[PDB]
């Protein structure tokens, strides 16, 4: 087996879209027909600082996309911010949306905005302060005409206590120009970049090597870099699980990395 | 679709001007004026010992002209039931018809003689002309306003005279298609507008617009507004009539006791109503301001109404599922 991903680059994963969510790989744009929906990228951040963009190609008045981040447990039919595990921006006026609450602690949005998205989560130390073990589930299925793998995802968290990940933040840019900080309070758990569609919204996510107004930081990582990082990590996850079940013993170096 | 047990020997009926009362003749020769709203008989008039085969209301509705089978025509006040006037002729009367804009005048179509227009004020009579002088069977009718007289013979010839001068203002013979004539069974007009219909022996109803006949002149080739028939059964039509508005036309198949309903503009068959297979259809009429239709068959009257979607279907009633149109702020606070 293996978790081989049907993607030439780190893109919006088709496995985590709603059945009412359409894609066009000419620009990998995403569109819908009725109400709101949510799609996510292939990768997912667990530590460090990183950055991506969204390019908007169509925004009629009855068309309002929302763009941001969301942890798993995020119902991909909801408009990216209806729960406490998602933090986005509404693309009518720059308005930060989280817990379905709109906040005007933000700049203004434009119809042809190439918006940059910077986000820094602490290392898994300050994220967990404990073991970040990744014992994975793997189940083989043969759907109608093709083979696929099932894994167990996380459960709806009843977390009502605020324990922000230390020194984590989110910054929003309009064409590189700092639109400002969006959310400093960031809950634990991995996050991934996500896009919510209203009726017929056309937007697309984009990585770093083809950027327009990139930050010159030496620490932040584009979408593709964290993408292949997570891909290699899950490769090693398959390696270690097949090791566990197949050969007696396991062993890992001095824990820190 | 609803009958009345309180009247017997129904032979001929006629709506009042507003479709509130119905005067039906009986075999005993009695007038039964029955009301729609109270759904009961309003009056009983001892008209004749002879059954009544022709009945017409006055414009004010206070007069009814009745024709017995004894060739006895008589005018009756609807409030009192008295025989206002009474006349008798040879060649027993086939039909009477008040003049729509002058109730003093009334046209009469007899069996073998030409139709004659009489007045009630003066017991005079004007014999209307006959084209072929040998028809012996000519139906005649006023138009919607009583300005012209349409006379159709057993030989398909159609004369349009002016009601005052009896002068030939238009003429044409209807065809059986190839080259032949057909017995003009009846001429009907619309109480609204100018469209009229002809029932003929070919079992084909021909709908025209009288203005087109007037502009067609004498001895012309006016085409019908519509041609209507039972292409399936080729059934004769004992009696036909327009709708009150004049956009629906009904025919009574006495052959199989059914009712065909077509439109005027398109002419497509609206529907069919089936009566008792054992009943012999005799008389047909439409409510002048209602989708209600009175039928007389085997001495029994039946009523055919037409209701809307409501009377139980009135939340906001819809027919087909509706996809909810989600908004931009549909999930916003």
Swiss-Prot record, chain A:
Entry's localization field: Nucleus
Summary of the tissues where the protein is detected: Ubiquitously expressed. Predominantly expressed in adult heart and testis and fetal lung and liver, with barely detectable expression in adult lung, liver, kidney, prostate, and peripheral leukocytes.
UniProt signal peptide: none
Residue span, B30.2/SPRY domain: 1-212
PTM annotation: Both monomethylated and dimethylated on arginine residues in the C-terminus. Methylation is not required for nuclear localization, nor for MLL complex integrity or maintenance of global histone H3K4me3 levels.
Region (Interaction with RBBP5): 1-257
Function summary: Transcriptional regulator. Component or associated component of some histone methyltransferase complexes which regulates transcription through recruitment of those complexes to gene promoters. Component of the Set1/Ash2 histone methyltransferase (HMT) complex, a complex that specifically methylates 'Lys-4' of histone H3, but not if the neighboring 'Lys-9' residue is already methylated. As part of the MLL1/MLL complex it is involved in methylation and dimethylation at 'Lys-4' of histone H3. May play a role in hematopoiesis.
Subunit structure: Interacts with HCFC1. Core component of several methyltransferase-containing complexes including MLL1/MLL, MLL2/3 (also named ASCOM complex) and MLL4/WBP7.
Protein name per UniProt: Set1/Ash2 histone methyltransferase complex subunit ASH2
Organism: Homo sapiens
Native organism taxonomy: Eukaryota, Metazoa, Chordata, Craniata, Vertebrata
Swiss-Prot record, chain B:
Residues recorded as bearing Phosphothreonine in the entry: 235
GO annotations of cellular component type: histone methyltransferase complex; MLL1 complex; MLL1/2 complex; MLL3/4 complex; nucleolus; nucleoplasm; nucleus; Set1C/COMPASS complex
A Gene Ontology BP annotation from the UniProt entry: transcription initiation-coupled chromatin remodeling
WD repeats: 5-46, 47-86, 131-171, 179-218, 232-274, 276-314
Residue numbers carrying Phosphoserine: 329
Tissue: Ubiquitously expressed.
Coarse class of the protein's main subcellular location: nucleus
Subcellular location: Nucleus
GO MF annotations in UniProt: histone binding; transcription cis-regulatory region binding
The keyword Cell membrane belongs to this UniProt entry's keyword annotation: no
Acidic residues: compositionally biased ranges: 323-333
Residues in cross-link Glycyl lysine isopeptide (Lys-Gly) (interchain with G-Cter in SUMO2): 112
Keywords: Chromatin regulator, Isopeptide bond, Nucleus, Phosphoprotein, Repeat, Transcription, Transcription regulation, Ubl conjugation, WD repeat
Subunit (UniProt): Component of the SET1 complex, at least composed of the catalytic subunit (SETD1A or SETD1B), WDR5, WDR82, RBBP5, ASH2L/ASH2, CXXC1/CFP1, HCFC1 and DPY30. Core component of several methyltransferase-containing complexes including MLL1/MLL, MLL2/3 (also named ASCOM complex) and MLL4/WBP7.
Function: In embryonic stem (ES) cells, plays a crucial role in the differentiation potential, particularly along the neural lineage, regulating gene induction and H3 'Lys-4' methylation at key developmental loci, including that mediated by retinoic acid. Does not affect ES cell self-renewal. Component or associated component of some histone methyltransferase complexes which regulates transcription through recruitment of those complexes to gene promoters. As part of the MLL1/MLL complex, involved in mono-, di- and trimethylation at 'Lys-4' of histone H3.
Protein name as annotated: Retinoblastoma-binding protein 5
Encoding gene (name): RBBP5
């Amino acid at each position: 087996l293996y978790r081989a991903c049907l993607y030439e680059r780190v893109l919006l994963a088709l496995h985590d879209r709603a059945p009412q969510l359409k894609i066009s790989d000419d620009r990998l744009t995403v569109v819908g027909e009725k109400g709101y929906s949510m799609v996510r990228a292939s990768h997912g951040v667990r530590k460090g600082a990183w950055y991506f963009e969204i390019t908007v190609d169509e925004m009629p008045p009855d068309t309002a996309a929302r763009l941001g981040w969301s942890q798993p447990l995020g119902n991909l039919q909801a408009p990216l911010g209806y729960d406490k595990f998602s933090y986005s921006w509404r693309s009518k006026k720059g308005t930060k949306f989280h817990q379905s609450i709109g906040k005007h602690y933000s700049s203004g949005y434009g119809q042809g905005d190439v918006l940059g998205f910077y986000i820094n989560l602490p290392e898994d130390t300050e994220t967990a302060k404990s073991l970040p073990d990744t014992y994975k589930d793997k189940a083989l299925i043969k759907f109608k005409s093709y083979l696929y793998f099932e894994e167990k995802d996380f459960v709806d968290k009843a977390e009502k206590s605020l324990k922000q990940t230390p020194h984590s933040e989110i910054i929003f840019y309009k064409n590189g120009v700092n639109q400002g900080v969006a959310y400093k309070d960031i809950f634990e758990g991995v996050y991934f970049p996500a896009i919510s569609l209203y009726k017929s919204c056309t937007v697309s996510i984009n990585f770093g090597p083809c950027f327009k107004y990139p930050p010159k930081d030496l620490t932040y990582r584009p979408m593709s870099d964290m993408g292949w990082g997570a891909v290699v990590e899950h490769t090693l996850a398959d390696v270690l699980y097949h090791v566990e079940t197949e050969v007696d013993g396991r062993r890992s170096p001095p824990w820190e990395p | 679709d609803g009958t009345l047990d309180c009247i017997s020997m129904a032979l001929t009926c006629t709506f009042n001007r507003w479709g509130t009362l119905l005067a039906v003749g009986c075999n005993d020769g009695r007038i039964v004026i029955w009301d729609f709203l109270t759904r009961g008989i309003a009056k009983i008039i001892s008209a004749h010992i002879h059954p009544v085969c022709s009945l017409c209301w006055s414009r004010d509705g206070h007069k009814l002209v009745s024709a017995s089978t004894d060739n006895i025509v008589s005018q009756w006040d609807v409030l009192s039931g008295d025989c206002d006037q009474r006349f008798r002729f040879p060649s027993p009367i086939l039909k009477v018809q008040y003049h729509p804009r002058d109730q003093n005048k009334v046209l009469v179509c007899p069996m073998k003689s030409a139709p004659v227009m009489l007045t009630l004020s003066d017991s005079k009579h004007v014999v209307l002309p006959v084209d072929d002088d040998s028809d012996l069977n000519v139906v005649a009718s006023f138009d919607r306003r009583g300005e012209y007289i349409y006379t159709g013979n057993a030989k398909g010839k159609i004369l349009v005279l002016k009601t005052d001068s009896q002068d030939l203002v238009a003429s044409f013979r209807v065809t059986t298609g190839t080259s032949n004539t057909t017995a003009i069974k009846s001429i009907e007009f619309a109480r609204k507008g100018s469209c009229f219909l002809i029932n003929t022996a070919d079992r084909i109803i021909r709908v025209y617009d009288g203005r087109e006949i007037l502009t067609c002149g004498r001895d012309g080739e006016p085409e019908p507004m519509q041609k209507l028939q039972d292409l399936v059964n080729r059934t004769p039509w004992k009696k036909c009539c327009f709708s009150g508005d004049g956009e629906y036309i009904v025919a009574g198949s006495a052959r199989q006791h059914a009712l065909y309903i077509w439109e005027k503009s398109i002419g497509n068959l609206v529907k069919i109503l089936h009566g008792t297979r054992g009943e012999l259809l005799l008389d047909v009429a439409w409510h002048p301001v209602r989708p209600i239709i009175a039928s007389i068959s085997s001495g029994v009257v039946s009523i055919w109404a037409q209701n809307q979607v409501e009377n139980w279907s009135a939340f906001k009633e819809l027919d087909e599922n509706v996809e909810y149109e989600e908004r931009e702020s549909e999930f916003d606070i």
